[PDB]
Curated annotation (Swiss-Prot):
Organism: Murray valley encephalitis virus (strain MVE-1-51)
Subunit structure: Forms a heterodimer with NS2B. Interacts with non-structural protein 2A (via N-terminus). Interacts with NS4B. Interacts with unphosphorylated RNA-directed RNA polymerase NS5; this interaction stimulates RNA-directed RNA polymerase NS5 guanylyltransferase activity.
Domain of life, per lineage: Viruses
PTM summary: Acetylated by host KAT5. Acetylation modulates NS3 RNA-binding and unwinding activities and plays an important positive role for viral replication.
Modified residues (N6-acetyllysine): 211
Annotated site (Involved in NS3 ATPase and RTPase activities): 280, 283
Location of the motif DEAH box: 107-110
Summary of the function given for this chain in its UniProt record: Displays three enzymatic activities: serine protease, NTPase and RNA helicase. NS3 serine protease, in association with NS2B, performs its autocleavage and cleaves the polyprotein at dibasic sites in the cytoplasm: C-prM, NS2A-NS2B, NS2B-NS3, NS3-NS4A, NS4A-2K and NS4B-NS5. NS3 RNA helicase binds RNA and unwinds dsRNA in the 3' to 5' direction.
Residues holding ATP: 19-26
Name of the protein this chain belongs to: Serine protease NS3
Chain ranges on the Cytoplasmic side, renumbered to this chain: 3-429
Region feature (Important for RNA-binding): 10-13
Length: 429
């Protein structure tokens, strides 16, 4: 759409800026937005998808009075705050006072993390009510349908069969490749299997996922790698010095079955959206001086993601954000129809909401599972629910078992990193 203009900072304005690699979002557009906001004395929240991007913003906004609310001194007089999407949501769910932001600027606003969706709903609600302006920045705005957008440098788009598991023959084109490859896989479990196969083939491999990103992504800069094997987390602003993307064009989707008690299952890998495909491809084609970038895609796209648990989880989060003067939160317009129940259905009382926030924010439990635990009067430190569940809920590692739980969320035991964490949570830590 149109280019950033100060009109966009006025109350009731919500603008999606379709801003692409190259010129000049973090180092030129964002700084100008913030300069204009300060000039108009607007109380501003700048929202990054990840701590990594929040640090990059800090670099870009040097010389402006900006407070960084992510883990470092401040005057206490700054009116621009930089944080993660989830930090805003998490703050809004606590009784601690949230400033009356006049302007929200959300980077990588396509992020479908539940707390990102919830943030957008809160923001859109405040804007619609005339209390704020919002700018959402993304290369894939609502209604994106093109998996193959124009780029800064040409990309060779190639339909290719992509392994979903280890292989012992064939796929020579994968391993013969002399440059750097970013390979989007459907899951962490797939990541581990693909990565180990490539390592046995002598390749230097970095694995990026939600958990590993903060520590592992900074290692990419050094160039000491052949493959980055990544989940969808790299769709939120990752910049690789790569010449090839491999994209299985799939993702495992969590889904809530409900279904007596409820559980969350992980779908078999299924087609991603056209917007997601464009974001995966968009890791390459960025540098006009680098020709011959390749994008290999292993399947089609599908726009129906209404079964994603994140949509319900977003409104569980949103039902637990107290709004000043009678305002009832709805999801951001383009995201409203994905699901919907009775408004306020997931709203919790004080002590339960506090337990809920701590389960999600400190224990890193999925929002649904944290909600199940909190909604049943369980105290944060009371792990008894992890052991006194039905028989069917026994958890197995290599079909064992190991040492439950009252409720099953497949996201806590479907890979090595996650099960290792959930077992520790069962303690402990």
């Amino acid at each position: 759409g149109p280019a950033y203009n100060p009109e966009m900072l006025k109350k009731r304005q919500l603008t999606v800026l379709d801003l692409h690699p190259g010129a000049g979002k973090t180092r030129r557009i964002l700084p100008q937005i913030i300069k204009d906001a300060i000039q108009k004395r607007l109380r501003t929240a700048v929202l990054a998808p990840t701590r990594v991007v929040a640090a990059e913003m800090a670099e870009a906004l040097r010389g402006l009075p900006v407070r960084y609310l992510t883990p470092r001194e401040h005057s206490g007089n700054e009116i621009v705050d930089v944080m993660c999407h989830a930090t805003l949501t998490h703050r809004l769910m606590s009784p601690l006072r949230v400033p009356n932001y006049n302007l929200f600027v959300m980077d990588e606003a396509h992020f479908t993390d539940p707390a990102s969706i919830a943030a957008r709903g809160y923001i859109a609600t405040r804007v619609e009510a005339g209390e704020a302006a919002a700018i959402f920045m993304t290369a894939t705005p609502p209604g994106t349908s093109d998996p193959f957008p124009d780029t800064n440098s040409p990309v060779h788009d190639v339909s290719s069969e992509i392994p979903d598991r280890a292989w012992s023959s064939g796929f020579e084109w994968i391993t013969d490749y002399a440059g750097k490859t970013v390979w989007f896989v459907a899951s962490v479990k797939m990541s581990n299997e693909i990565a180990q196969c490539l390592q046995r083939a002598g390749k230097r491999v970095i694995q990026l996922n939600r958990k590993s990103y903060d520590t592992e992504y900074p290692k990419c800069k050094n160039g000491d790698w052949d493959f980055v094997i990544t989940t969808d987390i790299s769709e939120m602003g990752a910049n690789f010095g790569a010449s090839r993307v491999i994209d299985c064009r799939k993702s495992v989707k969590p889904t809530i079955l409900d279904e007596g008690e409820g559980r969350v299952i992980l779908s078999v890998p299924s087609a991603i959206t056209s917007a997601s495909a464009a974001q995966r491809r968009g890791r390459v084609g960025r540098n006009p001086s680098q020709i011959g970038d390749e994008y290999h895609y292993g399947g089609g796209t599908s726009e129906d993601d209404t079964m994603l648990a994140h949509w319900t989880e977003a409104k569980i989060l949103l039902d637990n954000i107290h709004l000043p003067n009678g305002l009832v939160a709805q999801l951001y317009g383009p995201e409203r129809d994905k699901t919907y129940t009775m408004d306020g259905e997931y709203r919790l009382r004080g002590e339960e909401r506090k337990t809920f926030l701590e389960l999600i924010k400190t224990a890193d439990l999925p929002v649904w599972l944290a909600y199940k635990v909190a909604s049943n009067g369980i105290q944060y430190n009371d792990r008894k629910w992890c052991f006194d569940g039905p028989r069917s809920n026994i958890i197995l590692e290599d079909n064992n078992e190991v040492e439950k739980p009252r409720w099953l969320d497949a996201r806590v035991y479907s890979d090595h990193q996650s099960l290792k964490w959930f077992k520790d949570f069962a303690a402990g830590k």
